[PDB]
Amino acid sequence: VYMSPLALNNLASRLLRKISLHLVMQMVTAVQQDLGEVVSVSSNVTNPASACLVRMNVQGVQTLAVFIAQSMLNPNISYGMISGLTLDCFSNFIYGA
């Protein structure tokens, strides 16, 4: 398979078609409402903690998981391009963590 493009393309094509994950998650809302309490979000103040609670979407988790999944089936079909690798990204604890 690794000797012929065509052959490998089909391997990859099929490797992907098969992927199926079944996840259950809370309501996007309720999680906000909960951390919202844990941090004490002032609906007037803009602060790190507060801000991130909005870039919180479900679609992201989908994409992320599926990736984690394939990336685990065969290392030679695909690679990921990480976004936002600023010079000092690590000084943003959230992103960092």
């Binding site: 992927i19 199926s20 994950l21 079944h22 309501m27 679609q59 989908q62």
Partner: peptide, 12 residues
């Protein structure tokens, strides 16, 4: 009503 389940690789 708390958990909404998702089948992934969905074209929502």
């Amino acid at each position: 009503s708390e958990p909404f389940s998702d089948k992934e690789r969905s074209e929502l």
